[PDB]
Amino acid sequence: ETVIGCLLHDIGKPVQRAALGYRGRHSAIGRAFVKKIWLRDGRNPSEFADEVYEPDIEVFDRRILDAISYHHSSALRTAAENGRLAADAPAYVAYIADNIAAGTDRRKADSDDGQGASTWDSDTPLYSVFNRFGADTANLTFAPEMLDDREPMNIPSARRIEFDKYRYTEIVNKLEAVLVDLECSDTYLASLLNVLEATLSFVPSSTDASEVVDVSLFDHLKLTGALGACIWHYLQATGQSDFKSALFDKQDTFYNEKAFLLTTFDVSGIQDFIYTIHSSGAAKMLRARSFYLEMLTEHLIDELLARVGLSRANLNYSGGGHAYLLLPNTEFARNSLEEFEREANEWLLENFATWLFIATGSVPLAANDLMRRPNESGPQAHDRALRYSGLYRELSEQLSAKKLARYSADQLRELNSSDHDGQKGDRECSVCHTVNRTIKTINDLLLCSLCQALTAASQQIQSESRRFLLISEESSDGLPLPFGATLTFCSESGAKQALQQPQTRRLYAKNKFFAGESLGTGLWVGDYVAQMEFGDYVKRASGIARLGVLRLDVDNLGQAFTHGFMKQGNGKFNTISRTAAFSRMLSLFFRQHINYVLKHPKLRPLTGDDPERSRRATIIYSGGDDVFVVGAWDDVIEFGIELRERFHEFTQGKLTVSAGIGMFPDKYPISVMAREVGDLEGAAKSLPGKNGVALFDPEFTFRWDELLSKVIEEKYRHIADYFRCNEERGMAFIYKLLELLDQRGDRITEARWVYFLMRMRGPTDDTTRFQQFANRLHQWFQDPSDAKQLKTALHLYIYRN
């Protein structure tokens, strides 16, 4: 109840874009925006008051409404030099908050016709975050429509979006849903700081046309808290009993001071936990332990929060076990940092010995090093952001030492010579294959207590209803967590009487960011489970019955911000709100927008015959850099290009990918279901253009433009179409064909090529189109790369049937 002004001092943009009849600027809108609706009053928003000197009304009613008061750098005079507001109000906390935010965020872009001010507007859209990426400048405009979790995914557009009502009576009625619960509870810093991510994701914070606005409200509203709730945990340790004095003479105290701390933590060994399963559990436990490793992951930042009460915007980055974190550069937090890193690690030696080890590096951070200085030319603005790389490359070389000495010597010799429970190796598990637990041999296989626990998850966790959960404290039932916690899965429909208890350590919900009510502090998760077990996607397929694998990682993601801004304009654009934006969109593309491209797809060149025949695959983990999907081979190989055709519509030619798709039988083991498809994104990532794909082998390595055009829609859309009408014709003829493409380096194979070609026509078929049907297949034969596409086109039809 002392950090409340971190968020709500920017509410003056969209209310006059919704025409609720206020007047004045963003300080005047929001200081009466929470006067019209929050106090349950039925008055008109066109005549609200300015300033009251009431003695009996305290902070909870006055300075909650007066937590904004004055936030911009031009109206600092009234709240101080007329005595309108004293130091014990959080508006001063919110004044320096947006000042250090927009002083490090708001900069006009490099246009021709400058000196443009940002004022009251009701038409302007946000533009693409990917404009400044690359040596080209795009003009694509993020249309500020509704984005609270509907089908489809929302894409950038080039035209100027028409200003309507329907999406904007929907935004304010969403603000009618969760901005009426603004009361003295937990819903301050956990509820509001997630459900406004999607609503305010395409809405800009400015008006100026001498700039191209890429930062939204939320990537600035996060930075109002992440620099505002940061400094409050820097505040009383630095010696402040009056907030005016830190902005009356020491408003330029951060010339060379360090008041911020940039940290990380990574769980090194996420992938080599999920991909060691030797037996049964290949079908079920492959998804559950990845669901386990992502579920304590969000809990793993949450104990670095629960010790101090920071924001969940302090994770500016999140996804894949990794979470960049900004802290105050005090020493109470730095001490309790290493309390967090070591003790959770100290818990890990009871359950997972040498797999998971988390570790935190640190960079003490100034404030002038982010902002572009006055009078920074070419040889002067270039040296400002070299240190902005120097807080990342010399943050990676903080955890390029912790990942080499991971355990103390007093710790390992506890475990270096032990057999716990003192028993025999007749009881030894199958999945996690450990010995120390009494192996409770259920379901006719020796499975440990952990492997017993994950079998209890998949009764309800991969079903399509029980995607809610609960983290309680250190109890017996559930999945065990560091820092005194269990982890469970349930529903919160009729079990809210177990969700209104104070024995809940952490609370979450599923993908659907549920406004109106609260089903949990939800995050972005994987709910695409068509059927539960892996065997149900080889039990239906007319054609071959092969479980198809898919793994795909976006290339070069270490150069996403270190060298992804500094090639166009000499890198003045390197700032925290411009770099927490694409890492706020990747938390929707690879975590929620993949549910659109899977539940109702578009491209169907193998299956066809229905536009919204759902993809029968199942994604292992929707998160971050890497997507892992396994289903039947049929739906994956179309969707594996189709998702990339929802990827080249966002980066629009700057970010590259390489995927991997293989086909495997049902009972195939996992430990070589990820060591061979680790060559299929291991060979087409070794492409000179790096934007390709590799199917079924390292010798098929094809570009993304060479695959959907040359292979399928040219060559596969040649073969099975002449006997489209005779759909059941001899594929016992077509496996003669690709013998010849292996012996193509012999001379008479030209003769045998045309020989077998006109061994198909005659008087028993329609031969109006046969001379060209072999001639297309005759010209493809001679070229030493035309048939390279052809072999895959032949393989698609024989594996389709």
Binding site: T276, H278, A353, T354, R393, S396, E397, S400, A401, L404, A405, R406, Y407, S408, A409, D410, L412, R413, L415, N416, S417, S418, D419, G422, K424, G425, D426, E428, H433, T434, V435, N436, N556, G558, Q559, T562, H563, K667, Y668, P669, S671, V672, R675, E676
Partner: protein, 296 residues
């Protein structure tokens, strides 16, 4: 003392890690020395084993790849000074070995990475080989999926071993007659031919010569672990297994679960190695090797 360079012809092999369907290129010597205390009972009389149960006067390396004429010594775990791009930051962990020279150029971010990773696929392929399982009772037979490693046609595994030349002469007494190595060796796997050649003297044991890079998954004593850890760039593995051998003829049980250090790890100070014993319950001692050997 001399040392011994051991050139093999390992075509297919299977050193598992956590089961059978995977494999490893390296044999951490607690797997190799345990063979020398089970492929000596099959030649000696349990006197050759008892000659070398717990002496550890012999320092031997592990079974690391070689591609052609150059030893593929391991990628050390030292902090690279990658002042270059982040792709070759990531390209280091996709590289397990490198030739005998480039390590000093490697450690400061001053080296190539798309030739060493380009000789990864010159070592050999991580293959698989499907097989069909038991007629369990009278029912339908299952498969069992077992995966291996396959070398290139000009590779194998190397070894450097030194110590007392009498107990070194009994290694080459054993190895000229040690059969198919690896795990699943009663089938065609792990078979090879051991040959002797003169060592590279560029790879001397620098136990205190300011190059504290080992060539063996090893361990010091439990107390002296507190001394060799302040600047240790180390990784921990499991060296577990099963035991179920003659003179121990009961239900198969396990070795004791140990966690030795890495095999190319670089430390702060010199250390000693000793034979840890992993017998938990039962008659004859079974023991892990942990006696390292160093490198320039």
């Amino acid at each position: 003392m001399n040392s011994r360079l051991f050139r093999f012809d390992v075509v297919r092999t299977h050193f598992g890690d956590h089961g059978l369907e995977s494999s490893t290129i390296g044999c951490p010597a607690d797997t190799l020395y345990s063979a020398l205390c089970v492929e000596a009972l099959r030649m000696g009389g349990q006197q050759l084993l008892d000659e070398l149960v717990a002496c550890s006067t012999l320092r031997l390396t592990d079974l690391l790849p070689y591609v052609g004429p150059d030893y593929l010594v391991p990628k050390p775990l030292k902090s690279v000074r990658s002042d270059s791009s982040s792709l070759q930051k990531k390209l280091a962990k996709k590289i397990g070995f490198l030739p005998a020279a480039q390590l000093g150029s490697f450690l400061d971010g001053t080296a190539d990475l798309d030739d060493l990773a380009a000789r990864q696929t010159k070592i050999g392929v991580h293959a698989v080989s499907a097989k069909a399982a038991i007629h369990n009772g009278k029912k339908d037979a299952d498969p069992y999926r077992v995966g291996y490693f396959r070398f290139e046609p000009d590779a194998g595994l190397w070894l450097l071993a030194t110590g007392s030349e009498s107990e070194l002469g009994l290694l080459t007494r054993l190895l000229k007659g040690i059969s198919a190595l690896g795990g699943e060796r009663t089938s065609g796997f792990g078979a090879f031919i051991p040959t002797e050649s003169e060592v590279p003297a560029a790879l001397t044991p620098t136990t205190a010569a300011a190059s504290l890079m080992t060539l063996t998954t090893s361990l010091p004593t439990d107390d002296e672990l507190e001394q060799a850890l302040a600047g240790a760039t180390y990784r921990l593995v499991k060296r577990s297994g099963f035991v179920a051998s003659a003179t121990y003829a009961e239900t198969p049980r396990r070795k004791r679960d140990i966690y030795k250090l890495a095999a190319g790890s670089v430390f702060s100070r010199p250390f000693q190695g000793g034979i840890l014993d992993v017998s938990l319950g039962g008659n004859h001692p079974v023991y892990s090797y942990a006696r390292p050997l160093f490198l320039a």
